[PDB]
Amino acid sequence: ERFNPFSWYEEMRNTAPVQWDEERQVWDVFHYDGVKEVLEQKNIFSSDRRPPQNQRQTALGTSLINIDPPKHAEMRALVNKAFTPKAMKAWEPKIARITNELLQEVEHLEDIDIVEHLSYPLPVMVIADILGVPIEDQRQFKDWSDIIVAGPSNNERETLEKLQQEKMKANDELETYFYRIIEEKRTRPGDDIISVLLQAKEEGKQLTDEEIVGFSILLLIAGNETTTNLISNTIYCLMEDKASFERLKREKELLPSGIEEVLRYRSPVQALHRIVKEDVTLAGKKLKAGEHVVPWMGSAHRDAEYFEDPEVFKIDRKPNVHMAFGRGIHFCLGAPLARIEAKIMLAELIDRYPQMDWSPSFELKPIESTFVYGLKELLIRKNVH
Ligand code: HEM
Secondary structure (H helix, E strand, O other): OOOOOHHHHHHHHOOOOEEEEOOOOEEEEOOHHHHHHHHHOOOOEEOOOOOOOOOOOOOHHHOHHHOOOOHHHHHHHHHHHHOOHHHHHHHHHHHHHHHHHHHHHOOOOOEEEHHHHHHOHHHHHHHHHHHOOOHHHHHHHHHHHHHHOOOOOOOOHHHHHHHHHHHHHHHHHHHHHHHHHHHHHHHOOOOOHHHHHHHOOEOOEOOOHHHHHHHHHHHHHHHHHHHHHHHHHHHHHHHHOHHHHHHHHHOHHHHHHHHHHHHHHOOOEOOOOEEEOOOEEEOOEEEOOOOEEEEOHHHHOOOOOOOOOOOOOOOOOOOOOOOOOOOOOOOOOOHHHHHHHHHHHHHHHHHHOOOOEEOOOOOOEEOOOOOEOOEEEOEEEOOOO
16 A cells, blocks of 8 residues: 555665665665764755756756755855744734635535645645735636646646646746746835845845745745645544544644644655765765765654654654654754644644544545655545534
8 A cells, every 4th residue: 555655664674774776776764863864964965956057947946955055054044034933923813814714615515625625725825925925816826836736647648748848837937926026025025925035134145036036936845735745644643543533632732742743653755865975884884975865754753762652643742753844954944834834724623523534435545656645635524414
């Protein structure tokens, strides 16, 4: 089964936590301390993925996640200015408003898809609003986003060509859309991320307009699918372990902790990419500059040295030092937003439909990916009828 890569991770942690894969041409790292070192050692393991000159120079390609220090620190210090607990005080009620708008549109249905009707849309709508995208543009904004992260319908040759073109169209349309917004918010600010990024300064430096376009597009990519899966996956866990659901209803203040345990147990992001910057040894393995490394946080999260009874879902787990948000200088700067978006949507669902259970029409349909762990649909019956 493809909703279970954890058997394979165990087999690999127990034989060769660091191993070369000859087909994929990468060093896999399955063991907690190894994943930890790959992400912490910025200077050994590089996040530089900027496209060569002969490839398309997208604003995303040189955005925060694809660069190293010293530039990464300059850029990080600036975008961090828009992700403070102070901005969150304004984001929360927008997120509750959107959560209730979405539940209201399916109030009339006994069975609902957690993915299509609630978790897929919620991040897209939130991030539009907090970016400063006006309401009159938000349907076109959802369309662009559906397209830039879509997969192909079938494996036919023409439909793959079509997708590849419509994605480049969307990236370049989005970029022009964002370039306009930046000018509009240049002379008429507002309380939105873009306006904040425009006014930010650090040691007398500022973000260019390209950098801001790139980071905006980045937030779309980084925060949409992942947050969707954190919610879907959390429902899935509670429907699997009814005991934990029942306990969660009786102790509401456990929810943040049970979300953290979904982050550990069914991590939206199973792995990352790094490139070796200098020869290094790792669990006795000689890694040579230029070779590619894939730390699997999903496996690290099942290492008993750091998580007792790792194969058990424990909504009160303590300690729970997952790296679902990475670790080190590239640590997810949206983790606070992902956490409250999951919390608000999931609290409301639990409050309204405590007898919730699998739709008898349910199907296990996992995303066809190894780096991304989540469901295409998650059919649920409310049992309020
Ligand atoms: C459950 C939800 C999420 C998960 C599991 C997740 C996962 C991650 C991980 C693992 C990293 C480290 C990447 C690396 O080192 O290559 C990362 C970075 C990042 N994330 Fe998140 N993410 C989530 C939600 C979000 C949201 C909601 C946003 C923004 C709205 C966001 C924006 C970013 C950005 C901009 C970075 C790059 C930071 C840097 O390279 O300095 N993510 N994310």
